[PDB]
Each structure stands twice: as structure tokens, then as C-alpha cells.
Write a protein that holds these residues in place. Structure first.
Motif, PDB file in Angstrom:
ATOM      1  N   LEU A  38      -6.766  -3.182 -12.477  1.00 61.76           N
ATOM      2  CA  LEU A  38      -5.376  -3.183 -12.049  1.00 61.76           C
ATOM      3  C   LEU A  38      -4.798  -1.787 -11.886  1.00 61.76           C
ATOM      4  CD1 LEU A  38      -4.030  -5.923 -14.442  1.00 61.76           C
ATOM      5  CD2 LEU A  38      -4.860  -6.168 -12.048  1.00 61.76           C
ATOM      6  N   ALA A  39      -3.923  -1.592 -10.939  1.00 62.00           N
ATOM      7  CA  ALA A  39      -3.133  -0.405 -10.782  1.00 62.00           C
ATOM      8  C   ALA A  39      -2.349  -0.130 -12.053  1.00 62.00           C
ATOM      9  CB  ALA A  39      -2.139  -0.558  -9.657  1.00 62.00           C
ATOM     10  N   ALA A  40      -2.156   1.137 -12.355  1.00 58.17           N
ATOM     11  CA  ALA A  40      -1.417   1.567 -13.497  1.00 58.17           C
ATOM     12  C   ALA A  40       0.019   1.068 -13.505  1.00 58.17           C
ATOM     13  CB  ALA A  40      -1.375   3.107 -13.540  1.00 58.17           C
ATOM     14  N   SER A  41       0.493   0.722 -14.691  1.00 59.95           N
ATOM     15  CA  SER A  41       1.869   0.366 -14.867  1.00 59.95           C
ATOM     16  C   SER A  41       2.776   1.459 -14.266  1.00 59.95           C
ATOM     17  CB  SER A  41       2.200   0.186 -16.332  1.00 59.95           C
ATOM     18  OG  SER A  41       3.165  -0.771 -16.703  1.00 59.95           O
ATOM     19  N   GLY A  42       3.740   1.070 -13.422  1.00 59.62           N
ATOM     20  CA  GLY A  42       4.718   2.037 -12.907  1.00 59.62           C
ATOM     21  C   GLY A  42       4.239   2.746 -11.664  1.00 59.62           C
ATOM     22  N   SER A  43       3.003   2.467 -11.215  1.00 60.30           N
ATOM     23  CA  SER A  43       2.510   3.135 -10.012  1.00 60.30           C
ATOM     24  C   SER A  43       3.079   2.458  -8.766  1.00 60.30           C
ATOM     25  CB  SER A  43       0.981   3.147 -10.009  1.00 60.30           C
ATOM     26  OG  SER A  43       0.480   1.809  -9.924  1.00 60.30           O
ATOM     27  N   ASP A  44       3.104   3.189  -7.666  1.00 61.17           N
ATOM     28  CA  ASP A  44       3.628   2.738  -6.390  1.00 61.17           C
ATOM     29  C   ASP A  44       2.740   3.291  -5.295  1.00 61.17           C
ATOM     30  OD1 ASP A  44       5.415   1.533  -4.610  1.00 61.17           O
ATOM     31  OD2 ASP A  44       6.757   3.276  -4.561  1.00 61.17           O
ATOM     32  N   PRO A  45       2.144   2.470  -4.447  1.00 60.16           N
ATOM     33  CA  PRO A  45       1.176   3.006  -3.465  1.00 60.16           C
ATOM     34  C   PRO A  45       1.853   4.015  -2.552  1.00 60.16           C
ATOM     35  CG  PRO A  45       0.964   0.633  -3.654  1.00 60.16           C
ATOM     36  CD  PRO A  45       2.228   1.007  -4.378  1.00 60.16           C
ATOM     37  N   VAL A  46       1.095   5.046  -2.251  1.00 61.68           N
ATOM     38  CA  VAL A  46       1.631   6.190  -1.485  1.00 61.68           C
ATOM     39  C   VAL A  46       1.557   5.933  -0.002  1.00 61.68           C
ATOM     40  CG1 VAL A  46       1.370   8.661  -1.054  1.00 61.68           C
ATOM     41  CG2 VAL A  46       1.134   7.731  -3.373  1.00 61.68           C
ATOM     42  N   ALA A  47       2.664   6.129   0.704  1.00 58.11           N
ATOM     43  CA  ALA A  47       2.640   5.918   2.152  1.00 58.11           C
ATOM     44  C   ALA A  47       1.521   6.689   2.850  1.00 58.11           C
ATOM     45  CB  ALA A  47       3.966   6.307   2.772  1.00 58.11           C
ATOM     46  N   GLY A  48       0.839   6.043   3.794  1.00 60.84           N
ATOM     47  CA  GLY A  48      -0.217   6.735   4.552  1.00 60.84           C
ATOM     48  C   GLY A  48      -1.584   6.527   3.931  1.00 60.84           C
ATOM     49  N   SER A  49      -1.594   6.112   2.656  1.00 60.65           N
ATOM     50  CA  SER A  49      -2.917   5.853   2.031  1.00 60.65           C
ATOM     51  C   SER A  49      -3.495   4.561   2.565  1.00 60.65           C
ATOM     52  CB  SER A  49      -2.781   5.873   0.511  1.00 60.65           C
ATOM     53  OG  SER A  49      -2.009   4.764   0.046  1.00 60.65           O
ATOM     54  N   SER A  50      -4.797   4.417   2.515  1.00 66.66           N
ATOM     55  CA  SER A  50      -5.491   3.258   3.053  1.00 66.66           C
ATOM     56  C   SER A  50      -5.577   2.182   1.980  1.00 66.66           C
ATOM     57  CB  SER A  50      -6.871   3.679   3.503  1.00 66.66           C
ATOM     58  OG  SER A  50      -7.903   2.748   3.526  1.00 66.66           O
ATOM     59  N   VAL A  88       2.843   1.592   4.314  1.00 61.69           N
ATOM     60  CA  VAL A  88       4.073   1.955   5.020  1.00 61.69           C
ATOM     61  C   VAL A  88       5.110   2.283   3.973  1.00 61.69           C
ATOM     62  CG1 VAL A  88       5.888   0.960   6.494  1.00 61.69           C
ATOM     63  CG2 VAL A  88       3.409   0.584   7.016  1.00 61.69           C
ATOM     64  N   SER A  89       5.790   3.402   4.119  1.00 66.18           N
ATOM     65  CA  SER A  89       6.855   3.748   3.181  1.00 66.18           C
ATOM     66  C   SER A  89       7.885   2.652   3.059  1.00 66.18           C
ATOM     67  CB  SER A  89       7.522   5.046   3.622  1.00 66.18           C
ATOM     68  OG  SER A  89       8.344   4.906   4.719  1.00 66.18           O
ATOM     69  N   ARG A  90       8.446   2.531   1.856  1.00 60.63           N
ATOM     70  CA  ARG A  90       9.488   1.540   1.595  1.00 60.63           C
ATOM     71  C   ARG A  90      10.687   1.797   2.480  1.00 60.63           C
ATOM     72  NH1 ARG A  90       8.843   1.854  -3.224  1.00 60.63           N
ATOM     73  NH2 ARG A  90       7.555  -0.014  -3.559  1.00 60.63           N
ATOM     74  N   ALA A  91      10.995   3.074   2.773  1.00 57.88           N
ATOM     75  CA  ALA A  91      12.105   3.376   3.663  1.00 57.88           C
ATOM     76  C   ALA A  91      11.872   2.829   5.061  1.00 57.88           C
ATOM     77  CB  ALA A  91      12.333   4.869   3.775  1.00 57.88           C
ATOM     78  N   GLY A 115       0.651  -1.932   7.022  1.00 58.85           N
ATOM     79  CA  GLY A 115       0.379  -2.404   8.370  1.00 58.85           C
ATOM     80  C   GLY A 115       0.341  -1.195   9.306  1.00 58.85           C
ATOM     81  N   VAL A 116       0.093  -1.514  10.566  1.00 56.56           N
ATOM     82  CA  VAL A 116      -0.041  -0.537  11.622  1.00 56.56           C
ATOM     83  C   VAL A 116       1.107  -0.725  12.599  1.00 56.56           C
ATOM     84  CG1 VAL A 116      -2.398  -1.350  11.336  1.00 56.56           C
ATOM     85  CG2 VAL A 116      -1.262  -1.548  13.545  1.00 56.56           C
ATOM     86  N   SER A 117       1.672   0.397  13.035  1.00 59.18           N
ATOM     87  CA  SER A 117       2.923   0.276  13.796  1.00 59.18           C
ATOM     88  C   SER A 117       2.756  -0.521  15.082  1.00 59.18           C
ATOM     89  CB  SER A 117       3.464   1.672  14.097  1.00 59.18           C
ATOM     90  OG  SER A 117       2.461   2.546  14.604  1.00 59.18           O
ATOM     91  N   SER A 118       1.566  -0.395  15.687  1.00 57.09           N
ATOM     92  CA  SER A 118       1.280  -1.124  16.907  1.00 57.09           C
ATOM     93  C   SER A 118       0.841  -2.567  16.671  1.00 57.09           C
ATOM     94  CB  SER A 118       0.208  -0.358  17.700  1.00 57.09           C
ATOM     95  OG  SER A 118      -0.965  -0.142  16.918  1.00 57.09           O
ATOM     96  N   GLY A 119       0.787  -2.999  15.421  1.00 59.55           N
ATOM     97  CA  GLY A 119       0.339  -4.346  15.035  1.00 59.55           C
ATOM     98  C   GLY A 119      -1.148  -4.549  15.213  1.00 59.55           C
ATOM     99  N   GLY A 120      -1.579  -5.816  15.091  1.00 57.12           N
ATOM    100  CA  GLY A 120      -2.940  -6.171  15.311  1.00 57.12           C
ATOM    101  C   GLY A 120      -3.833  -6.360  14.099  1.00 57.12           C
ATOM    102  N   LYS A 121      -3.386  -5.885  12.973  1.00 59.71           N
ATOM    103  CA  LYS A 121      -4.159  -5.940  11.724  1.00 59.71           C
ATOM    104  C   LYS A 121      -3.189  -6.324  10.623  1.00 59.71           C
ATOM    105  CE  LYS A 121      -7.516  -2.499  13.117  1.00 59.71           C
ATOM    106  NZ  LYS A 121      -7.815  -1.041  12.971  1.00 59.71           N
TER     107      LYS A 121
END
Length: 224
Positions: free
Chosen positions: A105-117, A145-148, A167-173
């Protein structure tokens, strides 16, 4: 999964399929020998006897080990799309070994970083509205994708601090119907979320929304 590719054996040792009334329904993640993490909306208020979990298989219909449910616990603050996680206790314990293992599991309090895969997997539809579902597990890799940006898509109040987007801005995945509850992992194969909701599937400018393991770890840790 839209725009995905076949998973290989052992790609997700912890993934489970969740059938309901003998048909495809949701995914989940094995946390330990008798505990599955899934989305609350997969299970809340439904008759528990209708569900079956299957572990240790790429197929949702054959192979591996199955179990019925002993109990269901939804996040105490589950409301609408928010806090969309549940803990399932299994009637049959599932040992690790072979192609079965337990999620990290991801660490308590962690938040995935925008741009990461991130990589999402499931047995859901392969098109928006599709009625067929694959027998074998599919996976797709999408950026966080950033929360903003996600709030720009869905509205400020719609995306909470217990959700993240991918997701990807152009969609498809994307993930789609029938993928709910299943895992999204970071590039190390650590479990960061569960498939939760979105506006259609794989549409441009409408990200998939995921329940955040990092944010909800206190709940997980209590009942796992």
C-alpha cells in the motif's frame, strides 16, 4: 479498460475479480489472506451473498481460488462518490504463493504526483457503454492528472482530497464500467488507489477518478 493490453501472469499478484449474481461486477485488491479492498459503490447495501471473489487468475471465470464474503465494511464517510472504499472479509483464506500475493500500500498521507505514470487493471468494458467484457485481465498506463486540472474538468467541489485523477488529455486510455474497485498502481507496482468514477470512459478532457489509498490508509489499517 479502454485502450489497454493484456496483463501477464504475475503482473498484479493481488488482483481479484468480484462477480455478482454470477456475472462480472467489480475488481479488488487482496490485502492479506482474508481481506479485499474494493470500491464502496461495488458493495454498499447489496446482498452480500451475491458476491464471489476470485484470486490468482488472469481470467475472471476460471482458475485460481474463490471465496464468498463474510462481512463488508464501508468507509464511515462514504457519501456520493466521496470516500469510495470498502473492506471485504473473506470466508475462505487465500494463501500467498505462486501467482498470488498481497498488495503493498501507498504510504499514509501520500498523494500521487501529477505527471507520474500509473497502471490500472481490470475486466471491465473495453468501450464506453460496451456490453461485452473480456475474459482475461487488461491493463493500461496513464499519467496522474493534477487535482487542480481535474477540478477544472469536473468542478471544484466534485474532486475531494480523498480522490486523485489519471488519464490522457486526448482520451483513449481509461478504466470503465466493470473496472470499479480494481487497482491503480504506481510505476513500482505499489497500490495507490481504486477505480471509482468518471464521466464516460476515455473521453478527452475528462479524467478517470480514483479513490486514494494514501488518503484513506487510516481506515484500511483499522480493519485489515
Amino acid at each position: 479498460i479502454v485502450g489497454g493490453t493484456s496483463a501477464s501472469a504475475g503482473d498484479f499478484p493481488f488482483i481479484v475479480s468480484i462477480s455478482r449474481n454470477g456475472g462480472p461486477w467489480c475488481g479488488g485488491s487482496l490485502l492479506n489472506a482474508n481481506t479485499v479492498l474494493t470500491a464502496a459503490h461495488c458493495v454498499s447495501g447489496y446482498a452480500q451473498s451475491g458476491f464471489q471473489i476470485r484470486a490468482g487468475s488472469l481470467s475472471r471465470t476460471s482458475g485460481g481460488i474463490t471465496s464468498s464474503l463474510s462481512s463488508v465494511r464501508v468507509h464511515p464517510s462514504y457519501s456520493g462518490n466521496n470516500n469510495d472504499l470498502a473492506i471485504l472479509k473473506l470466508s475462505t483464506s487465500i494463501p500467498s504463493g505462486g501467482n498470488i500475493g498481497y498488495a503493498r500500500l501507498a504510504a499514509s498521507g501520500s498523494d500521487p504526483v501529477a505527471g507520474s505514470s500509473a497502471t490500472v487493471a481490470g475486466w471491465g468494458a473495453t468501450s464506453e457503454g460496451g456490453s461485452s467484457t473480456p475474459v482475461n485481465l487488461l491493463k493500461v498506463t496513464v499519467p496522474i492528472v493534477s487535482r487542480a486540472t481535474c477540478r477544472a474538468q469536473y468542478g471544484t467541489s466534485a474532486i475531494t482530497n480523498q480522490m486523485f485523477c489519471a488519464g490522457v488529455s486526448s482520451g483513449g486510455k481509461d478504466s470503465c464500467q466493470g473496472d470499479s474497485g480494481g487497482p491503480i498502481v504506481d510505476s513500482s507496482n505499489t497500490l495507490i488507489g481504486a477505480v471509482s468514477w468518471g464521466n464516460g470512459c476515455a473521453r478527452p478532457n475528462y479524467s478517470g477518478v480514483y479513490a486514494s489509498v494514501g488518503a484513506l490508509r487510516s481506515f484500511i489499517d483499522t480493519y485489515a
